[PDB]
C-alpha cells in the first residue's frame, strides 16, 4: 500500500523537471574565444620524510603549511627559506587527517583511533603540549574540519556526523540518514551551509542551526571520492571512480556538463578550483596530473611526472602558488611564470 | 653574503633539529610487523594469550626472540565490509590465517574467503602462511562412529591411498590419515595463478600446545633472504 | 620562573674570584645567555655571549684576554672566571636569556645581581630631565638619534626600549620599532624613520614615573645610551 504512494511521489516529482530544461548551455558558448596553452616549471623541493605522505594543508598568511605522514611525525616549514620550524612526535601511526585554526593558535589531527586530538602551541615555557581528546564515536574518522575556534565539525566511516563544543566537550547535534560510508565535506563562504558525500553515489545538504536536510542528487553510477565549491557559492563539482566528472547547481537543481576522454581508464583522487574560476585541476592514479577549461570544456596542459602515486593537492589565499605530494615521500611547489 | 646576523641563528637550529632523524630512521629499520585474521570458531584468543608469556579499535603485542623484535597487530570494532581500509597494508611482511578443520557443514565459507583473499589487486607481492588446529576432536570423532564425510564431500570414495610421500610420525589406525584430504583441497587452489611472485606454507597444530614462535622464525629468514637475490640483479 | 646567583665580596689587587648562577622552572636546553654590569653612578655595558650548542663564543676588547665562561647542561649551572682584577672594575652584575626563530621575541627576563668591591657605532639623546603634573590629560614624547642607517634589504629595522624604576631591575616594553609586549598595557605607542625614532605616551598614571634607555642589534658590537630623568 504505502509503495503505490512512495511510487506517486517519485513520479510526481520527476514529473517537474522537464520543463525547466529550458537551452543547452554547449549552444550559447560555441562563439567564446579558446583559452590557448599553459607551461610551468619546478621551483622548490622539500625532502624529510622517511615513509609515504597522506595529507597537508595551507596557511592563512600564506607562508607557512603542515605536513603529515604514516611514520608518526608533524612537520612545519618555511616556504621562501625551506627552513623548519618545529617537529612533533605522535602516539599513533595510523593518521589521515589534519587541519589549521585561521588565528595559527591551535591544530588538530586524527587517525583509525576514532579521536581527532588539538595541540597547543603557545606557552611561557618552551614545547608543544596536547589539550584536549573528544570521543564517542564507533568508526574511523575522515575528516574534521575547524571553523572557528571554539566549534568543529566531524565526520566518520559510520553515516552520521556530529557537532562538538570543546569548553564542555560534548555533542550538541547528529545528522543521519545515509546508508553507506562518508568520505569528504566542504564548508562555504558564509558558515551556514556545507555539503557532504557518501559511496551511496549521493550528495546532501544540510543547516547547521536547524538540522535537517534540504536536498539531493543520484547522478554518478560508482563511488565518489572528492567535492568543492565554487568562489560565488552556488555550484560545486564532484570527482568519481568510474574516470568521470560532473557538475552541478543549487536554483536549478540539474547537471550541466561532462569531461571525459576515450584514452583514460585509471580514476581520480582529487580537485581543486582557482581564484577567478575559469581553471580546474585534478590528479590520476597514474603519476599524472591534468588541467581542464571551466567554461569550454578541454584540456589544455599536463603537469609532467613522479616517481609514484599522487594523492593531494592545494592552491595559496593570493594564487601565486600550488604544491602537490605523492607516496615517494617528496614535495613540489610550481609557480609557472614567464 | 648578504645575511643579517639573526638569520644564522635559525639556520644553526634547523642545522642542529636535523640531526635526529638519522638515528630514528637506523632505529626504525630493525624492526618486523605482522597482521592476523581469522573468525570466531578459531582460538585466535586462546593462541594470543598463550603467546603472550572501549571502542578502541586496534590492539598490539610485543614479543621477542633471540634479541630480536617482533610486533603483531588485531583489528577490534568495524562493520562488514573489507574493501576500503585493507589498501593501507601495501607494505607488510606477512598475514596469518586460522581454521576450524572439526565442523564439516560450515567449511565452503572458508575456501570462499580464501579465494576472495587471495586474488585482490593490491597484495600481488605479500605471501600468507597457514596453521591448522583442533586435531583432537578430529582423531576422537574419527575413531567413533555416527558420522561420515561421504555425506558432504562425494570423490571422497574414489580417493587414492595416501600419497607415497606421506609420513607416519604417530602409530594410529589409518583411518585417522584424513588430513591430507583437506591439506590437497587449499593447495589445489593455491597451486594456479602463481609465477614466483608469492609463496604459501602449510602446518599443523594441536589444542594448547606450545614451541609455535620457534615456526615463524625460520619462515621469516627465508622469505627475507629470498627477496635479496631480486634486489641485485642475479635471480 | 626564577633564577638567583651568588658571590661578591672584597679583593686586592692582584686576586682572582669566581660567580655562578642557578635556574629552574622552564627547559634549559633550548635558551642562550648574556652578561651585562653597571657602574655606581654611571650606564650599562654589555660582555660577553653563549650561545645554545656551545659552538660560538664573543667577547669585548676591554676584557678581551683575561674573562671566559663556561656551561653544563646536566646540573643546570653556569660559572664565570677572572682574574688579575684592577682598581677601576667595581660594578654590579646581571644575567639575560634569549632565542630566535621566525617571529620571536628575543629578550624577556631579568634577573637580580650581586655586589664587588676592589681597593663602532655611538648613540646618542639630550634632554635630561623635564617637568610632569600627574593630571590624566598629560603627554609625553622622547626622542633619539643615530650615526648611520640601521634599515636592511629585508626590510625590518631593529630598536628597542627599556624602563626601570627605583630599586628594581628593568623592564621590556617594545621590540622592532612596532611591536607591544604581552603584558604592558596599551597606552604607549611608538614610531621612527630611517635615522629618528619618537615615543609617545598618554594618559599618565603615578605609576609611569622611571628611567628610559634604548639600544641597537645590527652589527655584533652592542652599545647602549645613557638615560633620561623625568
Known amino acids: 500500500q504505502l509503495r503505490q504512494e512512495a511510487e506517486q511521489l517519485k513520479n510526481q516529482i520527476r514529473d517537474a523537471r522537464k520543463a525547466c530544461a529550458d537551452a543547452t548551455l554547449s549552444q550559447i558558448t560555441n562563439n567564446i574565444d579558446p583559452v590557448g596553452r599553459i607551461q610551468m616549471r619546478t621551483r622548490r623541493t622539500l625532502r624529510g620524510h622517511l615513509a609515504k605522505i597522506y595529507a597537508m594543508h595551507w596557511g592563512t598568511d600564506s607562508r607557512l603549511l603542515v605536513s603529515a605522514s604514516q611514520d608518526g611525525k608533524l612537520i612545519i616549514w618555511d616556504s621562501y627559506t625551506t627552513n623548519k620550524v618545529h617537529a612533533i612526535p605522535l602516539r599513533s601511526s595510523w593518521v589521515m587527517t589534519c587541519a589549521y585554526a585561521p588565528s595559527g593558535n591551535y591544530v588538530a589531527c586524527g587517525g583509525l583511533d576514532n579521536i581527532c586530538s588539538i595541540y597547543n602551541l603557545k606557552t611561557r615555557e618552551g614545547n608543544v603540549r596536547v589539550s584536549r581528546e573528544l570521543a564517542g564515536h564507533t568508526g574511523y574518522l575522515s575528516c574534521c574540519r575547524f571553523l572557528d575556534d571554539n566549534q568543529i565539525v566531524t565526520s566518520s566511516g559510520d553515516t552520521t556526523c556530529a557537532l562538538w563544543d570543546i569548553e564542555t566537550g560534548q555533542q550538541t547535534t547528529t545528522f543521519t540518514g545515509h546508508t553507506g560510508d562518508v568520505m569528504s565535506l566542504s564548508l562555504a563562504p558564509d558558515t551556514r551551509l556545507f555539503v557532504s558525500g557518501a559511496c551511496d553515489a549521493s550528495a546532501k545538504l544540510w543547516d547547521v542551526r536547524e538540522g535537517m536536510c534540504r536536498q539531493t542528487f543520484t547522478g554518478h553510477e560508482s563511488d565518489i571520492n572528492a567535492i568543492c565549491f565554487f568562489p560565488n557559492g552556488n555550484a560545486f563539482a564532484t570527482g568519481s571512480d568510474d574516470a568521470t566528472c560532473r557538475l552541478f547547481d543549487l536554483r536549478a537543481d540539474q547537471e550541466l556538463m561532462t569531461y571525459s576522454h576515450d584514452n583514460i581508464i585509471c580514476g581520480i583522487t582529487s580537485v581543486s578550483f582557482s581564484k577567478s574560476g575559469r581553471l580546474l585541476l585534478a590528479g590520476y592514479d597514474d603519476f599524472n596530473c591534468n588541467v581542464w577549461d571551466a567554461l569550454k570544456a578541454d584540456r589544455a596542459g599536463v603537469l609532467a611526472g613522479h616517481d609514484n602515486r599522487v594523492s593531494c593537492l592545494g592552491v595559496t589565499d593570493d594564487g601565486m602558488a600550488v604544491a602537490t605530494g605523492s607516496w615517494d615521500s617528496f614535495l613540489k611547489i610550481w609557480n609557472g611564470s614567464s | 653574503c648578504t645575511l643579517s646576523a639573526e638569520d644564522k641563528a635559525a639556520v644553526e637550529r634547523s642545522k642542529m633539529i636535523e640531526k635526529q632523524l638519522q638515528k630514528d630512521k637506523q632505529v626504525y629499520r630493525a624492526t618486523h610487523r605482522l597482521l592476523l585474521l581469522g573468525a570466531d570458531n578459531s582460538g585466535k584468543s586462546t593462541i594470543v594469550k598463550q603467546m603472550r608469556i572501549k571502542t578502541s579499535g586496534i590492539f598490539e603485542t610485543k614479543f621477542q626472540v633471540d634479541k630480536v623484535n617482533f610486533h603483531m597487530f588485531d583489528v577490534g570494532a568495524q562493520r562488514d565490509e573489507r574493501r576500503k581500509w585493507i589498501q593501507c597494508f601495501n607494505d607488510v611482511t606477512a598475514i596469518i590465517f586460522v581454521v576450524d578443520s572439526s565442523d564439516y557443514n560450515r567449511l565452503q565459507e572458508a575456501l570462499n574467503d580464501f579465494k576472495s583473499i587471495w586474488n585482490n589487486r593490491w597484495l600481488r607481492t605479500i605471501s600468507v602462511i597457514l596453521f591448522l588446529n583442533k586435531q583432537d576432536l578430529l582423531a576422537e570423532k574419527v575413531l567413533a562412529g555416527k558420522s561420515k564425510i561421504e555425506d558432504y564431500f562425494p570423490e571422497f570414495a574414489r580417493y587414492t591411498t595416501p600419497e607415497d610421500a606421506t609420513p607416519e610420525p604417530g602409530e594410529d589406525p589409518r583411518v585417522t590419515r584424513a588430513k591430507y584430504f583437506i591439506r590437497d583441497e587449499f593447495l589445489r587452489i593455491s597451486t594456479a595463478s602463481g609465477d614466483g611472485r608469492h609463496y604459501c606454507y602449510p602446518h599443523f597444530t594441536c589444542s594448547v600446545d606450545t614451541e609455535n614462535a620457534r615456526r615463524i622464525f625460520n619462515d621469516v629468514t627465508d622469505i627475507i633472504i629470498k627477496m635479496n637475490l631480486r634486489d641485485c640483479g642475479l635471480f | 620562573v626564577q633564577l638567583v646567583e651568588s658571590g661578591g665580596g672584597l679583593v686586592q689587587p692582584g686576586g682572582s674570584r669566581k660567580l655562578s648562577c642557578s635556574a629552574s622552572?622552564?627547559?634549559?636546553?633550548?635558551?642562550?645567555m648574556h652578561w651585562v654590569r653597571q657602574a655606581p653612578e654611571k650606564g650599562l655595558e654589555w660582555v660577553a655571549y653563549?650561545?645554545?650548542?656551545?659552538?660560538?663564543?664573543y667577547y669585548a676588547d676591554t676584557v678581551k684576554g683575561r674573562f671566559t665562561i663556561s656551561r653544563d647542561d646536566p646540573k643546570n649551572t653556569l660559572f664565570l672566571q677572572m682574574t688579575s682584577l684592577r682598581s677601576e672594575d667595581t660594578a654590579m652584575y646581571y644575567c639575560?636569556?634569549?632565542?630566535?626563530?621566525?617571529?620571536?621575541?628575543?629578550?624577556?627576563?631579568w634577573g637580580q645581581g650581586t655586589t664587588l668591591t676592589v681597593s663602532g657605532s655611538d648613540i646618542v639623546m639630550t634632554q635630561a630631565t623635564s617637568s610632569v603634573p600627574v593630571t590624566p590629560g598629560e603627554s609625553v614624547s622622547i626622542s633619539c638619534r643615530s650615526s648611520?642607517?640601521?634599515?636592511?634589504?629585508?626590510?625590518?629595522?631593529?630598536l628597542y626600549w627599556f624602563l626601570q624604576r627605583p630599586g628594581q631591575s628593568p623592564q621590556l616594553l617594545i621590540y622592532?620599532?612596532?611591536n607591544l609586549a604581552s603584558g604592558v598595557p596599551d597606552r604607549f605607542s611608538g614610531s621612527g624613520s630611517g635615522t629618528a625614532f619618537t615615543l609617545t605616551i598618554s594618559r599618565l598614571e603615578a605609576e609611569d614615573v622611571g628611567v628610559y634607555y634604548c639600544?641597537?642589534?645590527?652589527?655584533?658590537?652592542?652599545?647602549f645610551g645613557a638615560g633620561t630623568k623625568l
Open positions: 639575560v636569556r634569549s632565542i630566535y626563530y621566525y617571529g620571536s621575541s628575543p629578550f624577556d627576563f
Open positions: 653563549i650561545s645554545s650548542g656551545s659552538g660560538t663564543i
Open positions: 622592532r620599532m612596532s
Open positions: 622552572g622552564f627547559a634549559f636546553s633550548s635558551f642562550g
Open positions: 648611520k642607517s640601521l634599515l636592511h634589504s629585508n626590510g625590518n629595522t631593529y
Open positions: 639600544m641597537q642589534h645590527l652589527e655584533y658590537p652592542l652599545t
